[PDB]
Amino acid sequence: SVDYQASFVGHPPGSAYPKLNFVEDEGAFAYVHHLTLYDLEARGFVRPFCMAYISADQHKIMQQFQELSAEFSRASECLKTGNRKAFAGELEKKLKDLDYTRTVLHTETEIQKKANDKGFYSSQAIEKANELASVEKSIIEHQDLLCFDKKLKTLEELCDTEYFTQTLAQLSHIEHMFRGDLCYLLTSQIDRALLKQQHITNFLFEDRHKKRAGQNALKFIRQYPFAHPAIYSLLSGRTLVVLGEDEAIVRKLVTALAIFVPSYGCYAKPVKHWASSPLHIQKWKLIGLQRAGTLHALSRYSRYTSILDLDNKTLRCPLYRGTLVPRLADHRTQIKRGSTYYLHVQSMLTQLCSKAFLYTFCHHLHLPTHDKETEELVASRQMSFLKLTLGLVNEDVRVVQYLAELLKLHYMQEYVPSFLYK
Amino acid sequence: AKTEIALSGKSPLLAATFAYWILGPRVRHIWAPKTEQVLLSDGEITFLANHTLNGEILRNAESGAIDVKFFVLSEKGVIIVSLIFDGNWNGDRSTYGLSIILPQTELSFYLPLHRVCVDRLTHIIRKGRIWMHKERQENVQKIILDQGQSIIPMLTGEVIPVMELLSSMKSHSVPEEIDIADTVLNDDDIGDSCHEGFLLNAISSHLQTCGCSVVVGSSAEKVNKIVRTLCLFLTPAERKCSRLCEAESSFKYESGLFVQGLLKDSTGSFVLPFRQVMYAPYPTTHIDVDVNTVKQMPPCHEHIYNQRRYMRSELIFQDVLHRDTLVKAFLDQVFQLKPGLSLRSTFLAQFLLVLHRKALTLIKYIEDDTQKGKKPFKSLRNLKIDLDLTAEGDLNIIMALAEKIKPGLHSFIFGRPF
């Protein structure tokens, strides 16, 4: 029933010194990393007391076995270093305690009595100093390479865990790592398993309010008119600013649409998210300005801009007939969790990356090319889009833009109208 | 107290155990590996078998069905995977248990196979659990007084391949980590109606079903230059559970793994074996390199299970009808990336990356709509258009990467309608 089984049948009968074994179930579906904590002041001078963690399905362990049994390796070993460290030190402490016996033993024996004792107890009083001094060297070597107190012995063994916090840190961190189900987890390995080989697609594009940072955008697109070219304007760029009356909203609704921005590369993000109004500058491709001084750079930079007015709707660059953004965003969409809408967005961008990936390469489209030199090749590059399934001449800009992002980094390591409607 | 079976190969696994349950015996009879230079002493093995015994004794209220065990003993380095049986009375723990014994440092090799191994053995007990009433023969009570002779035969032969199967993957050294594209794709372009038209037909078929099937050809090299190619489309944990087939190594169709091989098709008509193909985890293809054709079995979980239901208790079907634009895309330009360099692999992953991510949405998507009684999804008509899934070639593919993550997903959607 309700959880009690941390040691119920989570303890194999010793069965080896460091061993790591398994249990079946009925509802247990368990796993055990049997670790004994041998205690001098304890019967057999040993203490099997093995902490691990137990989950369900028999599977989210079995094929996930390594790192769980590679971190239970690190965690359970870590505490073993600690209680021994308390135990190793205190053993000589009670050695000195019994060393004081000899200090009295010598005085008592044969002082005036002339050894009126046997005294064969003195054999005990000296033999103990040997094997305890022996297991000491066993402890330090074992450290580097390879009745109420009896249960209360477990206390300091469990108490010194609290001190030597690393054992509390890992099992806390372990409880963080694995979760209720492996699958959403399992992809995360696979997702990052793939990412190792391909990194060019990583910098060219985006890759913890992310529940809200997604959900707000879904509440954005699904019920905000004219928002469609906004994404386009944002995706293509090459700049955008958004001003509003109360700044209590722009913070909320510029983290929503921050997903779409192509970060320059190995940086944090290009969304300044707002500033004052000097507006000198290819360094910041999203700004708030929360605001006739602005109305000048409004028109002085009639190129590379856009606006908003929550008071009465507007923008600057609504020209788009293609189908790509409709796939990136359709107002007749049923995506619910929003966080999932992030995934649908996140996935699609890889395709946009993928098409963009192709255009950079193919080693038949750059200046070395078959037909001729002047502009035929620029016509020739157009026929690449026949292989590259463009949407419309507007989409030609996007994929051409991502070259510039990709072209720049390989290089480093080496005109538009404007509408508006209510 | 032993039976020596030589293994064809270099480095097989270790022995197996068949201890009995009146008084719990350490071990009844032990199978043997190839005539190796040095083994692990039976006396050590006898204890190791007896070690699970009292561990097995620890179980209460024996079971309803056969259940698993698995040991790794750092002391006396070994990896053990035992079973608990269902008793004859089903309450009196007449368990006997069995486990192939595995040398240390080979759990990396083992663990991806662990599904294979349990499957192979759990069938043996399914055969074993009768319970051997042929040993309940017409015989005098002196005979009815029996275990150590009449039990081993049907146990012997049916457990012989398991060591060979496990030692097979060392021989058919299926690529563990990576490959430079000694596969097809390293070529410039095949450029022809048949082969290029074929190449798409297979890979699509290789995907709408999770697990590929034999490259049943007659070249043993051009036969092996497809199995390493169609396996770029599967996980690094699936770089194994595959086989690079070898020239006449007398190796049958084994249900467990889901990329395979053979050669020459037994020089004549050879059974699938029709019985063993169901016992695979998925439907699968029927790729050739002789005919350059393809086939496939019914949809992975709405009809194999029903076919499974027909045949599980008894004890080349269709061609690719679908042409995903997404894969027709992929394959069309992959050769256009000027091969020879590292480009295609990256593109491959980016293609692949999409599928898992695009799979993951569909995972989240359907699991988002709260499952309830009278409440299936029923929104597939919305689902198709919504997620950019309109090419029926593309839908089932991502629907086919579902089951590899949510095994019950595919029934959760098609069980009610079909």
Numbering used by the authors:
A (entry chain B): 96 to 120, 130 to 250, 314 to 374, 701 to 774, 778 to 787, 794 to 916, 929 to 936
B (entry chain A): 13 to 33, 36 to 159, 167 to 336, 366 to 468
Paper text:
Due to poor expression of SMCR8C, we generated a chimeric construct for SMCR8 (SMCR8N-C) by linking the N-terminal and C-terminal domains with a 20 AA Gly-Ser linker. The 3.8 Å map was used to obtain the final structure of the complex described in this study, because it allowed building of the most complete model. Structurally, C9orf72 is organized into a bilobular fold, with one lobe containing the N-terminal uDenn domain (residues 13 to 198) and the second lobe containing the cDenn and dDenn domains (residues 199 to 420 and 421 to 464, respectively). Similar to C9orf72, the SMCR8N-C also assumes a bimodular architecture; however, the 2 modules are spatially separated by approximately 20 Å. Interestingly, residues 194 to 257 form 2 α-helices that fold into an antiparallel coiled coil. The interface between C9orf72 and SMCR8N-C is extensive with a total buried surface area of approximately 2,100 Å2 and is mediated predominantly by 2 interaction surfaces. The first interface (interface 1) is generated by the interaction of the uDenn domains of C9orf72 and SMCR8N-C. This interaction occurs via a β-sheet extension between the central antiparallel β-sheets of C9orf72 and SMCR8N-C. The second interface (interface 2) is primarily created by wedging of the last α-helix (helix α11, residues 392 to 418) of the cDenn domain of C9orf72 between the last α-helix of the cDenn domain (helix α11, residues 840 to 863) and the bridging helix that connects uDenn and cDenn domains of SMCR8N-C (helix α4, residues 350 to 363). In the Rag GTPase-FLCN-FNIP2 complex, Arg 164 of FLCN was shown to be the catalytic residue for GAP activity, which corresponds to a conserved Arg 147 in SMCR8.
